[PDB]
Nucleic acid binder design. Sequence first.
RNA 1: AUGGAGAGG
Lengths: 130, 43, 155, 84, 196, 47, 114, 263, 138, 559, 65, 163
Amino acid sequence: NTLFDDIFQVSEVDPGRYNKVCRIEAASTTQDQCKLTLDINVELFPVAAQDSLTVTIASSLTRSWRPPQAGDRSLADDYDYVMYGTAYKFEEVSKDLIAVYYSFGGLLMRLEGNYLNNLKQENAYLLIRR
Amino acid sequence: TLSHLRRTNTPIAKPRQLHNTHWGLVCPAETPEGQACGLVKNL
Amino acid sequence: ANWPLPVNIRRIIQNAQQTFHIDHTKPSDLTIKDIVLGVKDLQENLLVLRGKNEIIQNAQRDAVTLFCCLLRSRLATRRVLQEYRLTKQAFDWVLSNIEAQFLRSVVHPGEMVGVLAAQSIGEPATQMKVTSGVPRLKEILNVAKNMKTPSLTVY
Amino acid sequence: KAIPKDQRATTPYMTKYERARILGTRALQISMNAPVFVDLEGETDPLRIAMKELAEKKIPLVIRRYLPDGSFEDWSVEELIVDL
Amino acid sequence: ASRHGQKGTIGITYRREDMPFTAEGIVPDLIINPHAIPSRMTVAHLIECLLSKVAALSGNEGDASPFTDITVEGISKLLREHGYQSRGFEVMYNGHTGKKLMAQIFFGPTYYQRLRHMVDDKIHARARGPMQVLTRQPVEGRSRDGGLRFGEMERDCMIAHGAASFLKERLMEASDAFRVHICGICGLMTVIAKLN
Amino acid sequence: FDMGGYFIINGSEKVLIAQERSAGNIVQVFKKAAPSPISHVAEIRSA
Amino acid sequence: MNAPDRFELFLLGEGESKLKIDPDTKAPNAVVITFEKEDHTLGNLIRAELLNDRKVLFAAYKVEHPFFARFKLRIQTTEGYDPKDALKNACNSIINKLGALKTNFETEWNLQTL
Amino acid sequence: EEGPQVKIREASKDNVDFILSNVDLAMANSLRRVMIAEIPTLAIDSVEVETNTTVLADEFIAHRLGLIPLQSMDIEQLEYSRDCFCEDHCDKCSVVLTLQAFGESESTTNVYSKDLVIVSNLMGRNIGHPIIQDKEGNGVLICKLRKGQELKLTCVAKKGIAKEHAKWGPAAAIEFEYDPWNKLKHTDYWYEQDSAKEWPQSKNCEYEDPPNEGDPFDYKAQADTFYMNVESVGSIPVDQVVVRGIDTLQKKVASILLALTQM
Amino acid sequence: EGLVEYIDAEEEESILIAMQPEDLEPDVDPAKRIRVSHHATTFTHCEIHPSMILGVAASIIPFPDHNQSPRNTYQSAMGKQAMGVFLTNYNVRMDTMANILYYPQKPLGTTRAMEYLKFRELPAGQNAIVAIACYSGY
Amino acid sequence: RGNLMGKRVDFSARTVISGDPNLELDQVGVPKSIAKTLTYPEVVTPYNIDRLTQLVRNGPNEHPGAKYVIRDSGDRIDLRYSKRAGDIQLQYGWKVERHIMDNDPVLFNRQPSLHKMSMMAHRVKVIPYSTFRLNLSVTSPYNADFDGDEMNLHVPQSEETRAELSQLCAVPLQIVSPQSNKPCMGIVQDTLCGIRKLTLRDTFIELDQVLNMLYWVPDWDGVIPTPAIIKPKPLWSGKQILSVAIPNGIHLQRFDEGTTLLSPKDNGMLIIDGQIIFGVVEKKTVGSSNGGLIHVVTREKGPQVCAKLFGNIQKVVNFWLLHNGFSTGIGDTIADGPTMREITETIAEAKKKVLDVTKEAQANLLTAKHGMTLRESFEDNVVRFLNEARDKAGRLAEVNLKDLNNVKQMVMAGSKGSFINIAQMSACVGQQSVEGKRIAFGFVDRTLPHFSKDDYSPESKGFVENSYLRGLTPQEFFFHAMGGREGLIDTAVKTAETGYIQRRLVKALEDIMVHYDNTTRNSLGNVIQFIYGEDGMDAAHIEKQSLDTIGGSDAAFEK
Amino acid sequence: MIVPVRCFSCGKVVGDKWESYLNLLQEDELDEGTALSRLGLKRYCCRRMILTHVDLIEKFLRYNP
Amino acid sequence: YDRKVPSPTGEYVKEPEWVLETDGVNLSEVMTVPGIDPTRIYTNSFIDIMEVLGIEAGRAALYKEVYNVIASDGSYVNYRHMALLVDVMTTQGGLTSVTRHGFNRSNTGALMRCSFEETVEILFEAGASAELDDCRGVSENVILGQMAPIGTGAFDVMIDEES
RNA sequence: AUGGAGAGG
Ligand SMILES: [Mg+2]
Ligand SMILES: [Zn+2]
Ligand SMILES: [Zn+2]
Ligand SMILES: [Zn+2]
């Protein structure tokens, strides 16, 4: 099923000598002890400043990648920007602060929270809408 | 042919180095490589 | 700290926490005796020379001293149990693999290393305020009575 | 004189030179149609057959390792460890 | 070789289809690697390419005289006046697929000169051939159908490798090999070996 | 276009390369090495 | 000297067939077909027309060496769908498109001047 | 019709400038490749030199003789010399044309392509005739003769493919451009200051709409609109060049399909 | 008429040579090269042209002042190995070996020194449409 | 020395070399004619009697064929002249001299042979054209380019010696060299610049091209990797598709500068389980370094897997670069206006400083440094100032360059380029030097007749303000010519002296090896080292590791 | 030698344009650019083929044999 | 000179001292001067080190110098090779040069030493002194055209009935 | 065969 779900507020956008991928820095609008850094393909899904994106972590929607057929098969998303990556590091800042590191084909991601079912697994479907 | 008809040979302190007095008399670039470098010069 | 040593240990360690898929939230099924006596018996099998007399044994321990230092530094009980948390099977596999790679890293008898050394020194010399480089090397090899730049470094 | 089967201080592992020598000699024997002691299983190349015959330790050769003093230690191919 | 010490041999030959092509349909008669530029610092190669391009378009004779005030800026301006990229770059298409190339290519006329050395005049091979009369070793020279000298350094290499049998083979079966008879007393080649 | 300046020996075109030498009848002083007893030498090649 | 003949780029040799269909042992229900005496001109087109079929999982071509005029084409389709049929359908699609294109160009040319 | 579309912009005896609509990149590029190489053409393949007392060498002349553009209108009802059962060459596969020249006047007696005289039987087929787009009517200049210099030889032209040799090339340079505004972003433009001011503007930009800065990148876009300009050497008419190209590609595809039927 | 003198090095030791004839007369373009202002006055001789310091094989090099000197040397040593028309009467001479280029061409980028070397009349190479690019990797 | 220590041999060849991205590392492109010329004797056995019969039936001129047939009596049958070259009944025990065929072990060598890597055993692949063809990752231990280079190839004549070549002199074995305890082979040129251009985070590859690259890998499992981007367009990344070439179980970790497990500048290098996690792949990774990827793969998976890795990486990267494109023009040697202005004023203030120091020294106010002359201190100051000027202008030009600058890209990739190249092509080529000193006075109290006597100004003593882009002045050109001349001279002298010295070293350490007691001795039994390398380890199987016991405080150590 | 029959790069015929080029040069007193432009040599490769060429056959015909 | 020195707290910390460089060498009297550390004093002349401090110190100094020359160009050669060279240069008891005056005066085989530098005179004096050749040298078996007892040829292969 | 010149990495 679903592993994580939260709404973040884009606080910073950084095009570090790039033109297709910009590193984003957002914070949770629910938890004051939660933050997120995430590389985003702006050329596909543009992310301006002061935006409120809906972020979700899933494990499904291994075998070879078959053709899309979204209007034929179970897409299980209807989001705007979906990626697939792999967790590679579980960092513990404090006992009440746990950070995780995902890697989406080079597009890295650092999610700092507290309360998680995010285990070290190839399964990492990051779904973002609005 | 032109190059070979204007050649300078030198038998035997630093006779291989391009001396300052070679200005306007000897070509600075045109010289054999490997062995007889600097010794064999062109006008 | 960084020095050329025969067997790599870090790559073996990170190959143990992958081949066995160990989680970092589970107590190790090891014992103090297992780790301590295990590593202490691991150094016994690291043979370079294989004589039975005292001299050969001394030369042996002297030959494997540094790598034994590295081994003890990397396979300390604290480090083994806390830094990466290795299980029993994983630890034994690490020991066996280290011993194997050590026996592989031994120079093979018959190795013409004289010519190999001469080539290993002569070859980079082709790619070359005191005197340095080729002329200095020439001075060194010729053992020159008079060197072009004699120096006295006094502390 | 010689050296007894016990108290042999030489490396129990077969060196690369010893391996290349054994494989070479055996492949030479096979190249001159010598009796094969292993199942060919499709292999016809004398070198490859020698390798497969080495992996099964079906090679009846021996190695006389010379010591610089003049002594020598004997190591059968069946006894030598091939870790390379 | 070009005219700036940029020498090199032909790696391969491609037909006009496999060759990359500009929008004008022009295909390069020659393709050189950029890596042969920064390490050797032959800027005048690029400059003479630009100048030859402008002189080609304008139909004039490009002045590549040594000490003149003709700068890359002026040439670039003259090139831009003809409707091309001032820095000589051209958007080309991959001949195999027809798809555009991400990076543009420095494309233009350059005076190249076919040198003296050619492969068919260099290629040599001898399995066995004529020997010398004194040393009974393979003769010297490609024109004499000779063999290559297994120099001392090569011997050193084969020593380093440890291939003793190979070293013996090169110095016996490959080159010269003689069967001699030796006396068991004096130990010299005095023996009058009356065979048969 | 042939500029000449060469000889013809047995059908073979030969060329005499200019031979460089030190100008004679010129007085030159040279500082001698340290192990040498003499310090300076003023020489001249007479032709 | 050692250069091969020019007709070896379009004329088949002795015993050489045009197509060599081999069962791909990598993934199930796949095929590798060896095209002889053909280059990118055909391979790129066929491969591009094999990706238009939505019942085709994989489709790629490659020329293992520019010296020899030949290329391999790996195709993988869904279960119950033989890849040869996909190849034939793609080919016929190509033929139809080319025919229509020819007709259109002819009808266009029949309205021009000078 | 129903599929791909053509929009002829310019047309002449030597050039055809048109827009190709509703087509895949691979098909257009393959069409280009076929138009460049795989179109059958007639050109001099054999040269029998009798007397050659001119400046130029024998095969030096044979080269430019082979490079001469010959008529290839009815080349399709001609046959390959490798397919015909005749010994060497005949009239059903090859076209024989002689060349006889000799210096007469004190001035330099030029030798062009107009001096080539068709000898073999054409039997109705429009073929072998050297293309002369020259104003004076001379054509391709073979060589130059002095006062007492003579050139006597016999040329044998055979059916060949430009893939075998560039002399059988029916076309010169084919202009090819898609997406003049780089809206597909297949090209990362190099620049120093401004990427637009430095790079010139293509002619094909007048037929498409300029991108708006208020619009994001169209990632679902493909290459549909193409701009081509095919130039003929003279051997085969431009329209016939592209038509024979299409038919050639179609024919080899049909040959592969035929092989599929055979296996 | 006492307009040009013959000067050897020994006499060159005691004169002041002007590099350009414009260095006798007493805002700028950043593109051009930086040249040192003439701080000398008592000139006795002026250089004909600075491009005369080069030789025959080195005068064929386009923009030799924009290259590294050993590259100019390499080109000077490889210019003697290029094929072309070495003599017009090549067809009546019995040389042991001779190579003549099929279609020689006079370079698009020439030198004012090439005029006297007759290189545009007897060239040794062709202007090839070159492309600096990474293609097949061959 | 000429007939015994090194004599000419049979069964050899020599040809001009060239590269081939589609050849394997342990392969060599051998021309067909050479394949027909060189021969190997093969004894007729029941295993190969058919193939040998076919080879004899083909004879010479047609490869694969044979040259001679040796019988029991020892009579040599010449197949090209024999009346019975069509009817031969090969008896068991007969020798057949067949042509060199594919997958045959030959010895590839290039002079000068400096080390054991100069002679390596390759597998033969018969190809058209008259050129020896080799991989681009074998060009470094051979030290060779393609500017008319020629190489030699030798052919073994028995089974034991071809085994000796295949088991000792084999190229995959010679990957990790016992010289600098590091791999002597790596990815270079277009493959390096390409693998740099591919692993960029902006580099995204769509479906079709990804499929092609995937099929370009011979060791591809046939499984399409799940794309990094799912919606809106299914896109892959360069890192993702490059991971296909990397075998499983490969773990690489390297931190460079500000690498904090997130890499804001996408630096460093993290690869997990044969899958690159993050970092731009270039010379520090895919190159021939100590802790490089090649060393790891070789020491982990083996030599064969490493050579096959060379193959895969080369094929994929060259394929992507083929349809991407990369170039270099004069535009990549041009800096901005204000940049060139700052460079010019930098050189100006430099010459101004030199002027101040000069006038100071001429006023006898200069105080000599302890242990050197006033004049020496002056020259040192001027030279140092001019060097600092060239470096200042050079960095000023390097900062101005963009990331799209092709030359700068080749510098970043590590393919070919450096800082000084940028500095000289665009900014300033700097001060010329002869015999350690600046251009001396060839003439009396002056360097050239165009200057006045006693002119120690920079532009006189051999300083060049202009870059290669702007063009050098006559004086500057002549001085630079002097410098380059000295360069060539001392280069020739260098390689000569190095040659002789190398010979001496070889002849000195000739009869030295390790016996079966790990005792490094000679021909007299004299012990050089009781234990070889003072530890008994081979230089090949040795990696630089960190001893984390010697560093840190006692508090951290105890903790 | 003599004017090349066709351009190397593309393959356009340029053999019948030499005498016309000379006529456009000396008779009409035009520059090389306009002369090459009127001959339909738009691409600078074909333009090169004539602009770069040197007719050496004229010097060759001077000999009697 | 800057220097890494163990701090009393533990970690190595940069502590910069003053070092006197010197043109001129006479180690025999400089080290005996009161004021400096006579245990760290060093010269680039290993020939003086060999005379003053011993043959082992000369060994270490020689290796230090060679390694310094190699690393001066930014290159890197493993320890065992250069150590082997220095060892073979120092095992005779003194500093043996790599020339005809040095190692070529050894008690090795005549054929081995005749294959380098002075050939004829060596053969002459060997023929005069009547020297026995061990024939276990590389170049010697090379001349004899035999499989030299090096590498693969270091041992022998026989057969023992185990079938 | 000896001897010599030039060139290639
Ligand atoms: Mg080279
Ligand atoms: Zn006797
Ligand atoms: Zn016929
Ligand atoms: Zn053209």
